CSV table of C-alpha atoms in Angstrom, one decimal:
chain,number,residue,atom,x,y,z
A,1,UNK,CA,-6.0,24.3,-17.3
A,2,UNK,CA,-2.9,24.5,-19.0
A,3,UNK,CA,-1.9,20.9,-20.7
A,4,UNK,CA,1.2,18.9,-19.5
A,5,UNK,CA,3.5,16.1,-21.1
A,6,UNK,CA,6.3,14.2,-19.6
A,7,UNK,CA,8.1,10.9,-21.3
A,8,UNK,CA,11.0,8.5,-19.3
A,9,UNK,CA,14.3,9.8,-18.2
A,10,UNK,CA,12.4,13.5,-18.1
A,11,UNK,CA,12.7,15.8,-14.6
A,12,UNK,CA,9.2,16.3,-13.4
A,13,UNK,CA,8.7,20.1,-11.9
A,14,UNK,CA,5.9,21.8,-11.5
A,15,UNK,CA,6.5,24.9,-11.2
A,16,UNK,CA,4.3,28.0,-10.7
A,17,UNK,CA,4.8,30.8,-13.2
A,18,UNK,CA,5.3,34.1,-11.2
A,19,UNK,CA,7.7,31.7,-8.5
A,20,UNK,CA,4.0,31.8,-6.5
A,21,UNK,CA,3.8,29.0,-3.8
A,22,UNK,CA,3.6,25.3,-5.7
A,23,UNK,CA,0.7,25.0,-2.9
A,24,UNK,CA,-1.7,26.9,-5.2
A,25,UNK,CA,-1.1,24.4,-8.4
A,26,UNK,CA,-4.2,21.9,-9.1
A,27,UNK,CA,-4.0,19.3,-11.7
A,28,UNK,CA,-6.8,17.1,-13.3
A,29,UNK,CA,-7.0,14.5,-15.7
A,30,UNK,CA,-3.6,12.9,-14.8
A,31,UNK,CA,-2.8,9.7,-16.2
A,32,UNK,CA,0.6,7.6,-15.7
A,33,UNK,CA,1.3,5.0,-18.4
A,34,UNK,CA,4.2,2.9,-17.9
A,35,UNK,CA,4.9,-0.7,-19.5
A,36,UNK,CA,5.6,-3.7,-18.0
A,37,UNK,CA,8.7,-6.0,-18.5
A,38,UNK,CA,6.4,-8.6,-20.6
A,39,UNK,CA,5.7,-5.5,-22.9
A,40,UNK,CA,2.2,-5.1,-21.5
A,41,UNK,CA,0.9,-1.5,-21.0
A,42,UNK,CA,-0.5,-0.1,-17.8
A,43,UNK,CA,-2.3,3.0,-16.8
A,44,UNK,CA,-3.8,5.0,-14.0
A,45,UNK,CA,-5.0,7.9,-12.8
A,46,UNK,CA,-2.6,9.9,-10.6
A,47,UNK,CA,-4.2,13.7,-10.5
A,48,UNK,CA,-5.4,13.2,-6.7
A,49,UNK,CA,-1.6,12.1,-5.9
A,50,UNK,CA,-0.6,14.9,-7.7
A,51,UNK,CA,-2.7,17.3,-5.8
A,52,UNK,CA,-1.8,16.3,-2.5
A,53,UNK,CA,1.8,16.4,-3.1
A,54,UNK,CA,1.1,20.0,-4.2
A,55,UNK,CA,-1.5,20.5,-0.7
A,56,UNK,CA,1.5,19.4,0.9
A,57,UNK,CA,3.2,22.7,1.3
A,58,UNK,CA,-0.4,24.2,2.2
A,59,UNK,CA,0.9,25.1,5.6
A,60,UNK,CA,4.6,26.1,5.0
A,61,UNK,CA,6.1,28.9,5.9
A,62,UNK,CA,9.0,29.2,3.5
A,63,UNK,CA,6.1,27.3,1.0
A,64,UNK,CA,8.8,27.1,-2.6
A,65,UNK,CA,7.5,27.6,-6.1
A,66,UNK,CA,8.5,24.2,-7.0
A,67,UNK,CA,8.0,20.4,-6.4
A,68,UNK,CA,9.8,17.5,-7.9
A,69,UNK,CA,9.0,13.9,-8.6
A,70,UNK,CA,11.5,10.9,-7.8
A,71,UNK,CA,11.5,9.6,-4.2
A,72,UNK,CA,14.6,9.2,-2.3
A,73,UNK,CA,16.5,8.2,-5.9
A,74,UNK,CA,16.1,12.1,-6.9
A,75,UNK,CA,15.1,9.8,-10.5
A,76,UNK,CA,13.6,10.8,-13.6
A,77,UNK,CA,10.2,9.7,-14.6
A,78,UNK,CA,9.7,5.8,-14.8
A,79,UNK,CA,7.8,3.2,-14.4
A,80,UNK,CA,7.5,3.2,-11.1
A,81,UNK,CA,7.0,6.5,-10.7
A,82,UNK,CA,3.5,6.2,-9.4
A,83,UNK,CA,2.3,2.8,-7.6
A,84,UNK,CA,-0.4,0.8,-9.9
A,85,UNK,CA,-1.7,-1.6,-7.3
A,86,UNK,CA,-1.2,-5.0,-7.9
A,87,UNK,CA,1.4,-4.4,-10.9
A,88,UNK,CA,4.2,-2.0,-10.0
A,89,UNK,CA,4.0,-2.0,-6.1
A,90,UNK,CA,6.7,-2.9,-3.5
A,91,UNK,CA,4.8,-6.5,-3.1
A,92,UNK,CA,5.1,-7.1,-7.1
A,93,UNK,CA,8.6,-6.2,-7.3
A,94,UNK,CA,10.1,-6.9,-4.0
A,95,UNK,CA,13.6,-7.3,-4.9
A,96,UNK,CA,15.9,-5.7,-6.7
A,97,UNK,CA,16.6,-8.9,-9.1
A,98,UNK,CA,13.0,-8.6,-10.3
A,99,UNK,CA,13.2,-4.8,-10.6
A,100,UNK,CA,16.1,-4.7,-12.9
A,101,UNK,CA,13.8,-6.8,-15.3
A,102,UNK,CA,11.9,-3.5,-15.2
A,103,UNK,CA,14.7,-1.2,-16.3
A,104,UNK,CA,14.3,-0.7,-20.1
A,105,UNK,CA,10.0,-0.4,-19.6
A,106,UNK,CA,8.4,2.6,-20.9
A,107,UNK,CA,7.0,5.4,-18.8
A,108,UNK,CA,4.6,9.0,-19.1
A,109,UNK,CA,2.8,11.4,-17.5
A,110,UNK,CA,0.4,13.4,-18.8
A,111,UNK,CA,-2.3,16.0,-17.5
A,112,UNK,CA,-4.0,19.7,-17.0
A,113,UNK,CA,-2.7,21.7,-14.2
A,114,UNK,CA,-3.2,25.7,-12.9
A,115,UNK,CA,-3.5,27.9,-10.3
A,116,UNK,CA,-6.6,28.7,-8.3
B,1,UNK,CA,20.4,-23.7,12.7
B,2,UNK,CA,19.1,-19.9,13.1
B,3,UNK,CA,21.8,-17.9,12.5
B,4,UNK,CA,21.8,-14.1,13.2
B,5,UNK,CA,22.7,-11.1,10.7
B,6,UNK,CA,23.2,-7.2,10.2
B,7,UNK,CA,23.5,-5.0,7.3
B,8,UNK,CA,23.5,-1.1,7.9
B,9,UNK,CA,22.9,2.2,6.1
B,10,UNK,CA,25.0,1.6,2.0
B,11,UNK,CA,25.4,-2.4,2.7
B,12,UNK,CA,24.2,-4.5,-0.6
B,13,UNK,CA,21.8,-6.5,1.1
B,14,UNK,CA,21.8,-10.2,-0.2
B,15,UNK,CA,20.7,-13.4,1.1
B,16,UNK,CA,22.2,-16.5,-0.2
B,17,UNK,CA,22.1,-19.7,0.8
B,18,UNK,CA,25.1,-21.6,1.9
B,19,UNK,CA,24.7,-24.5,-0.6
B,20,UNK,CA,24.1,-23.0,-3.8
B,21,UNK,CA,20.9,-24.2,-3.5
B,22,UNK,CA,17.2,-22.9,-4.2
B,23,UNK,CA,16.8,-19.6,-2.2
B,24,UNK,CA,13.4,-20.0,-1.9
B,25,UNK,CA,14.1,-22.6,1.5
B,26,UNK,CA,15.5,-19.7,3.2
B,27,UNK,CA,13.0,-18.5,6.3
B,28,UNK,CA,13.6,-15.7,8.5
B,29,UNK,CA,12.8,-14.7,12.3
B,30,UNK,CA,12.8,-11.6,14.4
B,31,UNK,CA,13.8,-9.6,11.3
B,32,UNK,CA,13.7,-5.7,12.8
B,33,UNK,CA,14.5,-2.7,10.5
B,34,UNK,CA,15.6,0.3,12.2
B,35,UNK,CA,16.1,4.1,10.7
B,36,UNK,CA,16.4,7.5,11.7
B,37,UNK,CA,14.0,10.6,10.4
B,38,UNK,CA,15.3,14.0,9.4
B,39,UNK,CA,14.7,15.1,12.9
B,40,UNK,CA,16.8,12.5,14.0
B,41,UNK,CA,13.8,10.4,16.0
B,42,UNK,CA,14.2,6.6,15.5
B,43,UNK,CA,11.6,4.3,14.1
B,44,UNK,CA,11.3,0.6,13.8
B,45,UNK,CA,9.4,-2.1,12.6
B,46,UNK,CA,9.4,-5.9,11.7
B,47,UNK,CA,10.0,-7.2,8.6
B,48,UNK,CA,10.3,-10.7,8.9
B,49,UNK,CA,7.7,-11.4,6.8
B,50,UNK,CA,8.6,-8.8,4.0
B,51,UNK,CA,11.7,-11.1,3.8
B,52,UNK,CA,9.6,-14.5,4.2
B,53,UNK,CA,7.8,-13.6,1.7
B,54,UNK,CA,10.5,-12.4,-0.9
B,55,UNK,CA,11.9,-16.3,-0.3
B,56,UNK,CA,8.7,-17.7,-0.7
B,57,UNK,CA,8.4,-15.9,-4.3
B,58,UNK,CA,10.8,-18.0,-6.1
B,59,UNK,CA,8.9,-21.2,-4.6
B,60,UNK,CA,8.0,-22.2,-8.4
B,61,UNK,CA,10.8,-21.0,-10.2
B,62,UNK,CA,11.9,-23.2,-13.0
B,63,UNK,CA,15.5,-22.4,-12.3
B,64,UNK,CA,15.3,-21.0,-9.1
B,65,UNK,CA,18.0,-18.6,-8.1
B,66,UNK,CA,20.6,-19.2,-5.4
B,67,UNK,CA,20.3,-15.6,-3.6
B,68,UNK,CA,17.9,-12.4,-3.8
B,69,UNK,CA,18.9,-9.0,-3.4
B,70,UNK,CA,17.0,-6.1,-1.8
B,71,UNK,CA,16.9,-2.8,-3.7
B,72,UNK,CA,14.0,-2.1,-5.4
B,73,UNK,CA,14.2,0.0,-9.3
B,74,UNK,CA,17.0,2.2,-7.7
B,75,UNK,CA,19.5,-0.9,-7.1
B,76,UNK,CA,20.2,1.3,-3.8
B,77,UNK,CA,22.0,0.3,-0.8
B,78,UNK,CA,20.2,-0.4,2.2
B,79,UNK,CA,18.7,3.2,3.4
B,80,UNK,CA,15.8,4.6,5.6
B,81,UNK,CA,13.6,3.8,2.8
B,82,UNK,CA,14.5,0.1,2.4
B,83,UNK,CA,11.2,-1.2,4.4
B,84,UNK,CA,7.9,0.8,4.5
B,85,UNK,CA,6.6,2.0,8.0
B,86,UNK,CA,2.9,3.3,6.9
B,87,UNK,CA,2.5,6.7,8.1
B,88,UNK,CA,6.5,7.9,8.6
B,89,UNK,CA,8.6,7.2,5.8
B,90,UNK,CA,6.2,5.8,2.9
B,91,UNK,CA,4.9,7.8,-0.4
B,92,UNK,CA,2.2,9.4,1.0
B,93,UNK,CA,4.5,10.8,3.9
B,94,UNK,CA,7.7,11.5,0.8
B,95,UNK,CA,6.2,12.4,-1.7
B,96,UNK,CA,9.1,14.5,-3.7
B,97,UNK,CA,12.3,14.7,-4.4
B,98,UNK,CA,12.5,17.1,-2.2
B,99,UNK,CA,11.1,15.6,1.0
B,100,UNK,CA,13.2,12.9,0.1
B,101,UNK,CA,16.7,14.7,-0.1
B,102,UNK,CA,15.8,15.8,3.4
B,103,UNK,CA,16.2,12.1,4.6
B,104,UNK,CA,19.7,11.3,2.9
B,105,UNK,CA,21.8,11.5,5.8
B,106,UNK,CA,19.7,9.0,7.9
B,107,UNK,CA,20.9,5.6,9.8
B,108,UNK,CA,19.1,2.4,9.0
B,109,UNK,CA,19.8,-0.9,9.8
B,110,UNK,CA,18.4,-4.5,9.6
B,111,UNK,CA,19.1,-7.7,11.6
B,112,UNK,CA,17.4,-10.9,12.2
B,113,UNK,CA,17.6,-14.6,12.0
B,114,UNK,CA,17.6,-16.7,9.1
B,115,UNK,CA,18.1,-20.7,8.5
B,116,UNK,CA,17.3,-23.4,5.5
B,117,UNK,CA,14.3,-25.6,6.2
C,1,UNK,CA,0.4,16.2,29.7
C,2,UNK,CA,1.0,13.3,28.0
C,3,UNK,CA,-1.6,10.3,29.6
C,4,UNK,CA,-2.3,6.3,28.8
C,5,UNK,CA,-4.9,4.4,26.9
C,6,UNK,CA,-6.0,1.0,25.9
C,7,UNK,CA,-8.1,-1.0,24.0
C,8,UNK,CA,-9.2,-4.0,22.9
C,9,UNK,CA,-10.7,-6.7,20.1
C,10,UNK,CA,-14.3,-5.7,19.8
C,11,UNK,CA,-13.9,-2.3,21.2
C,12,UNK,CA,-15.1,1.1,19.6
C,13,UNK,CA,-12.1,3.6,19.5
C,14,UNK,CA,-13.1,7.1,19.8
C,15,UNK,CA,-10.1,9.6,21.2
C,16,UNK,CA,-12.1,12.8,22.1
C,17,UNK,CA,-11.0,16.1,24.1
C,18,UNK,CA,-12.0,16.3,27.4
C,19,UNK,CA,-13.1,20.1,27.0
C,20,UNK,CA,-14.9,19.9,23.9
C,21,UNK,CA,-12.2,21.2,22.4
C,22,UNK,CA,-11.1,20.3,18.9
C,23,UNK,CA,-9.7,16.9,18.3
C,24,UNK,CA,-7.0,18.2,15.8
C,25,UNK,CA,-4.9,19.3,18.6
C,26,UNK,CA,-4.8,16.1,20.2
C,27,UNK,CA,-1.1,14.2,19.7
C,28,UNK,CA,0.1,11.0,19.9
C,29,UNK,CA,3.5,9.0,21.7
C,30,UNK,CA,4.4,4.9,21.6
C,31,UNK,CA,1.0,3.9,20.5
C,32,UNK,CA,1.6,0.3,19.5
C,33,UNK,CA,-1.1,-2.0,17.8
C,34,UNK,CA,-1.0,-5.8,18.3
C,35,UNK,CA,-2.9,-8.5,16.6
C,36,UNK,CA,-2.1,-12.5,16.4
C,37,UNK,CA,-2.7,-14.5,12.6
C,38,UNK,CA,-4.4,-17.5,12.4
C,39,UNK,CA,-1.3,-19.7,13.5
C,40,UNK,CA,-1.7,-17.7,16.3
C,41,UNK,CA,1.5,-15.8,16.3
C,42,UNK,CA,1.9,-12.3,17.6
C,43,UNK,CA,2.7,-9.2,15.6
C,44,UNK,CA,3.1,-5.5,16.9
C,45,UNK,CA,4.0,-2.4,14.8
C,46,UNK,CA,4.0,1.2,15.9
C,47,UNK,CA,1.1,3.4,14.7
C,48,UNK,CA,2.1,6.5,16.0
C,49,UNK,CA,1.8,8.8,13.0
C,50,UNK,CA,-0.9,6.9,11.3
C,51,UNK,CA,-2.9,8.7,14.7
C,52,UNK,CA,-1.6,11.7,15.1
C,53,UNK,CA,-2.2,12.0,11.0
C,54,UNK,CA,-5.6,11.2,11.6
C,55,UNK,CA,-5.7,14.2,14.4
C,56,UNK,CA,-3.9,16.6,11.6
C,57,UNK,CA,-6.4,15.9,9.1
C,58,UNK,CA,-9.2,17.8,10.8
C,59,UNK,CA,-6.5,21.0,11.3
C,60,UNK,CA,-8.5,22.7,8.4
C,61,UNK,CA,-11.6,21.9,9.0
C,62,UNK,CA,-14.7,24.8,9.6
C,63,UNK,CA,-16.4,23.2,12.6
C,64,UNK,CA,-13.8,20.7,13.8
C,65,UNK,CA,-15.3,18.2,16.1
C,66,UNK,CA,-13.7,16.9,19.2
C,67,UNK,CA,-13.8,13.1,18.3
C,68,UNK,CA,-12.3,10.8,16.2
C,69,UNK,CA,-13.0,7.1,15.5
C,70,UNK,CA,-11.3,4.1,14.3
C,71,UNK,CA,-12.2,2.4,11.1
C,72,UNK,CA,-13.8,2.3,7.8
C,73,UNK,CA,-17.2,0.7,10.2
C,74,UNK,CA,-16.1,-2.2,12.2
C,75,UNK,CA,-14.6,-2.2,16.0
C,76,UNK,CA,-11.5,-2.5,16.6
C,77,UNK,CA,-9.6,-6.2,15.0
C,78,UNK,CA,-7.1,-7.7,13.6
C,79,UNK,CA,-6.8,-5.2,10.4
C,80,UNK,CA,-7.2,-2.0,12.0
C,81,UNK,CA,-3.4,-1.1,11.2
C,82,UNK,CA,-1.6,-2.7,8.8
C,83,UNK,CA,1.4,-4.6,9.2
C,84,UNK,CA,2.8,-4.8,5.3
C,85,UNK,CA,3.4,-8.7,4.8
C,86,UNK,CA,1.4,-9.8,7.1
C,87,UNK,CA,-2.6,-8.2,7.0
C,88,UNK,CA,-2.2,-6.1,4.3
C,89,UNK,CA,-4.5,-6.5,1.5
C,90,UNK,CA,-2.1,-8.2,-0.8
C,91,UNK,CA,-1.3,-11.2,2.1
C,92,UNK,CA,-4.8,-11.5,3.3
C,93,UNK,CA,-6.9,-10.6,-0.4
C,94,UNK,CA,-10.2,-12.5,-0.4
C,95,UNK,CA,-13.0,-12.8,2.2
C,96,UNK,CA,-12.6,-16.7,2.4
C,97,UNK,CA,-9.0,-15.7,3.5
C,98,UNK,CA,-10.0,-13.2,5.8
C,99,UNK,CA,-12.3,-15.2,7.2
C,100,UNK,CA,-9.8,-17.5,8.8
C,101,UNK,CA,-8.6,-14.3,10.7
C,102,UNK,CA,-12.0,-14.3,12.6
C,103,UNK,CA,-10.9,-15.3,16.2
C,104,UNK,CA,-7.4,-13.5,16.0
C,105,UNK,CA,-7.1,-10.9,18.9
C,106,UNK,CA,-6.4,-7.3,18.3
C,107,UNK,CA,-4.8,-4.5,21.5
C,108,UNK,CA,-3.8,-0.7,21.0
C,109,UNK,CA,-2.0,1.0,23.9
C,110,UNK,CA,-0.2,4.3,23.5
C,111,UNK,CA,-0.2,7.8,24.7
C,112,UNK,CA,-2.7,11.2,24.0
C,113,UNK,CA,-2.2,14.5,25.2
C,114,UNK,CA,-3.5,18.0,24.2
C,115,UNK,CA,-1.3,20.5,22.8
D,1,UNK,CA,-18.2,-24.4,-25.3
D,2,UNK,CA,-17.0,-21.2,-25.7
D,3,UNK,CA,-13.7,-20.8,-24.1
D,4,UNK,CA,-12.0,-17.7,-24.5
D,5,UNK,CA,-12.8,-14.3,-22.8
D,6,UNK,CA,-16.4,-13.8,-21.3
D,7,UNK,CA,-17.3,-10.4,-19.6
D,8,UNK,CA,-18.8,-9.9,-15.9
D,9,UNK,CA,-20.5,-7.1,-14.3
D,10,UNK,CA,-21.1,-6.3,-10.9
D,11,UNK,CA,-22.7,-3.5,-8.4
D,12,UNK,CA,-22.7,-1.8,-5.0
D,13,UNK,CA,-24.0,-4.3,-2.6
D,14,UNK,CA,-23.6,-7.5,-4.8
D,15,UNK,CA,-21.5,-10.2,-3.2
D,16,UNK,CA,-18.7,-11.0,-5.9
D,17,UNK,CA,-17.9,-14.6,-6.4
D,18,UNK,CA,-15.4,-15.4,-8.9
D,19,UNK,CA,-16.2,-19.3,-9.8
D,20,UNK,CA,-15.6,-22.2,-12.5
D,21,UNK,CA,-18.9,-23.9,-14.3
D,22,UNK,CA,-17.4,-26.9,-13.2
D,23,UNK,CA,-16.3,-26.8,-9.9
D,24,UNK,CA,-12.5,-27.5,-10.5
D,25,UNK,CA,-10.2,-25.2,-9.3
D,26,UNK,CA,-10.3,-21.2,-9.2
D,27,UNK,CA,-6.6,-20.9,-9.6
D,28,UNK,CA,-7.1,-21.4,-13.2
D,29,UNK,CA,-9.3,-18.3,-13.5
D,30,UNK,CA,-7.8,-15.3,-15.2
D,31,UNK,CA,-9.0,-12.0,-16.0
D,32,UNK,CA,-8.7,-8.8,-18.2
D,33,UNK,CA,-9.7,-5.2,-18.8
D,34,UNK,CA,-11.5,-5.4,-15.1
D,35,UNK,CA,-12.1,-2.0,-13.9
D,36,UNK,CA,-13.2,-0.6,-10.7
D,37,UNK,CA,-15.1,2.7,-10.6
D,38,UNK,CA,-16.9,4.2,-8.0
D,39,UNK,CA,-17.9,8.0,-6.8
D,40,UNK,CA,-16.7,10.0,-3.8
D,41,UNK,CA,-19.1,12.2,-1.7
D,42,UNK,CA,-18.7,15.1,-4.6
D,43,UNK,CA,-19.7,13.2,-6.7
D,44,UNK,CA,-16.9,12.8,-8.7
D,45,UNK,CA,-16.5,9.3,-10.4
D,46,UNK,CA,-12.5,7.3,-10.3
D,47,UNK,CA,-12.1,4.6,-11.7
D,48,UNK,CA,-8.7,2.1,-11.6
D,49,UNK,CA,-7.6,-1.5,-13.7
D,50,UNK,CA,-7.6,-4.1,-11.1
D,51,UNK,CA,-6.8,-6.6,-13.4
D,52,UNK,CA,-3.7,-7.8,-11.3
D,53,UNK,CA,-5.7,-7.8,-8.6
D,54,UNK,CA,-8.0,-10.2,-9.4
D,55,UNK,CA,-5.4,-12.1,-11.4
D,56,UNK,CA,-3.2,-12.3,-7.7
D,57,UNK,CA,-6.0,-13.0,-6.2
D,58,UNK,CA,-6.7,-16.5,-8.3
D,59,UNK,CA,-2.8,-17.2,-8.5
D,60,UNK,CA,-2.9,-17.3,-4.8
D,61,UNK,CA,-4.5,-20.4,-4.6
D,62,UNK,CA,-2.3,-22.2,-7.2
D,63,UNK,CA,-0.2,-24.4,-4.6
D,64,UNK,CA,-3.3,-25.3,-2.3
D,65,UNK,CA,-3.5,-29.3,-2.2
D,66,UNK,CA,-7.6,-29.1,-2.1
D,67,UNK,CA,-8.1,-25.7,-4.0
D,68,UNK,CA,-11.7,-24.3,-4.0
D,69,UNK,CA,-13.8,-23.4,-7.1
D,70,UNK,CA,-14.4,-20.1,-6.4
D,71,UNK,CA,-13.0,-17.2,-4.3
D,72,UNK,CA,-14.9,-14.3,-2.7
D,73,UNK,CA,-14.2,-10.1,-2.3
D,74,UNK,CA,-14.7,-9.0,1.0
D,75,UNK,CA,-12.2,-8.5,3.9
D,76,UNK,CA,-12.6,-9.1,7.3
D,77,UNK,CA,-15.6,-7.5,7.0
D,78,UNK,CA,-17.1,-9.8,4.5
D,79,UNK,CA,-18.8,-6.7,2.7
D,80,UNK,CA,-20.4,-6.3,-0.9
D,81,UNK,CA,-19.3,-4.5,-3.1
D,82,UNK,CA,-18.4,-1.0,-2.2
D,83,UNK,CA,-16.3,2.3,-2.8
D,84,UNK,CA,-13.3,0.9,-1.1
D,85,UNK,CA,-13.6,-2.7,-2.7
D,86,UNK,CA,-10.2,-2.0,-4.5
D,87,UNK,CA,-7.9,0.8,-3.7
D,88,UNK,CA,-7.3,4.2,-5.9
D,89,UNK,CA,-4.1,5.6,-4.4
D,90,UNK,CA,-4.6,8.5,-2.9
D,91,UNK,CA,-8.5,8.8,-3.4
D,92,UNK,CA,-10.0,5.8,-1.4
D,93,UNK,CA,-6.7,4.6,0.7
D,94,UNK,CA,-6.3,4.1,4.6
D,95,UNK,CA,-4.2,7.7,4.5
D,96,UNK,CA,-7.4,9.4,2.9
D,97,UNK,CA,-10.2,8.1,4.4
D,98,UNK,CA,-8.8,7.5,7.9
D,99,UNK,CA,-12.0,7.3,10.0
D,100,UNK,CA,-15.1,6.1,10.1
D,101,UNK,CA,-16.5,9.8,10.3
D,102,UNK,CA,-14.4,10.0,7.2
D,103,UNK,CA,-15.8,6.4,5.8
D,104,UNK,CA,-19.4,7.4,7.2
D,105,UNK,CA,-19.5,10.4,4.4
D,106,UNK,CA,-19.2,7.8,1.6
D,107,UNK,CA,-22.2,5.3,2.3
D,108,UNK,CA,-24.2,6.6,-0.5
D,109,UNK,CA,-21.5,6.6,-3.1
D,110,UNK,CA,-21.8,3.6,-5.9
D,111,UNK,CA,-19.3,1.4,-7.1
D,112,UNK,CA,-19.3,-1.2,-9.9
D,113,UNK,CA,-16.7,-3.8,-11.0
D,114,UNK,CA,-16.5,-5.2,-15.0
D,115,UNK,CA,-14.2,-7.3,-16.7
D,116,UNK,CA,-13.3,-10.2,-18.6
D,117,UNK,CA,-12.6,-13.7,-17.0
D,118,UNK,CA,-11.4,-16.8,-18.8
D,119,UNK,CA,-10.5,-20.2,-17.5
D,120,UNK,CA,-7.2,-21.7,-18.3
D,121,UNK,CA,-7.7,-25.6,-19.7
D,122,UNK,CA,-4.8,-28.2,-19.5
D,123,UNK,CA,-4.9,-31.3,-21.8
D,124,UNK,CA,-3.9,-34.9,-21.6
């Protein structure tokens, strides 16, 4: 269980060391911190989101020794990165006027991960 | 009066009302989203009340805008991830970046109704 | 071969292989569920992936069974798929509110085959 | 009368009902530091801030003409609380448990719900 930190505006890859399939890679302990516009902070475990991106490519046949966070924006790490229900979610911030009050709010990622 | 509209695939997508006046009287009817997958299937769904309810969120706004705009953090153009269909194109079914980059050359549109009460 | 089914408010939905197979293989095609709201209007979305996702999870599985069944229990209603804005759990939140969903009908229709 | 924060606690199979002392309206309820936690069929333990949630869930009634005093959890199925009573995403969540053979596996696991509620107060 090697550790892992990532802070806003980073590229999030996991990669595997040896360029092994990402599909072996198991994380634990992951927590995604972001603040709110009104300054408040947030939290909340991600490590089983994390996991199943990585049992995604379980049954691949070209399976790549890589996986990268950021949805269809190809975006660095932010804070909506990962969905807080209730708080950060596409009901929340519906539109794109209340989402650019969102745009200067902190965001990080921290956690364990390694092969098995 | 219902009146109809369309927006496709890199449209801003923004509702305003013809007076200037609170968005939040704006209601919407038979509002259908439409995208292609990577594979080049096509999915639908409703989304009327995705949009009812974006309206309906400005209903005690102090100064209430005249317009809302759909975009989301990315301030991106209307694309195949503009509305959420559970199961085919939501975070669970993307996960990554590159899922997602597999899904940038897909169609989406949206049409529907919308009048002023 | 691809071959119809339907069901309705109140029912139990199991899909199951006829041959004892395992249910992983079994697919899905225009499987549309339909409820009404308390004002009584009607609302339809398509819930083909959510099943066949349901089929796939059971791909990796040691002894595989050859069923499947809806829900988390309760037969099928109103919130067995959701419809985001409309019975999801931010629009319908508490029980009082849910409770004014009571009487609303509830149909699924699509296609199964084998593969 | 106290009337700043005071703290709530709640179990597997206990009905919640968030209420006022004097029967005026729950949308002046609000809430903070509530956490869900509950176990999986490992035995593993999650837990997630529903603070929003709950805070939503009292906001929602803040345009109702005759507003109640209290507001229940439940869902259609009118349940207690439970393991799904708030979602973890990707843990407890429609795409993770799909089925009820799926569901069925996590009878036995526990769940509790604490926090802090306070009631807002208007003056004259």
């Amino acid at each position: 269980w090697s550790p892992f930190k990532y802070s806003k505006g980073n590229t999030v890859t996991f990669k595997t060391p040896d360029e092994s399939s990402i599909a072996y890679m198991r994380f634990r302990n992951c927590v995604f911190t972001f603040t709110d516009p009104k300054g408040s902070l947030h939290s909340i475990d991600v490590t089983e989101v994390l996991n199943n991106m990585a049992k995604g490519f379980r049954d691949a046949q070209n399976p790549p020794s890589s996986f990268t966070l950021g949805g269809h924006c190809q975006a660095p790490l932010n804070a909506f990165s990962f969905v807080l229900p209730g708080v950060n979610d596409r009901a929340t911030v519906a539109t794109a006027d209340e989402a650019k009050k969102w745009e200067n709010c902190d965001a990080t990622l921290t956690g364990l991960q390694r092969i098995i």
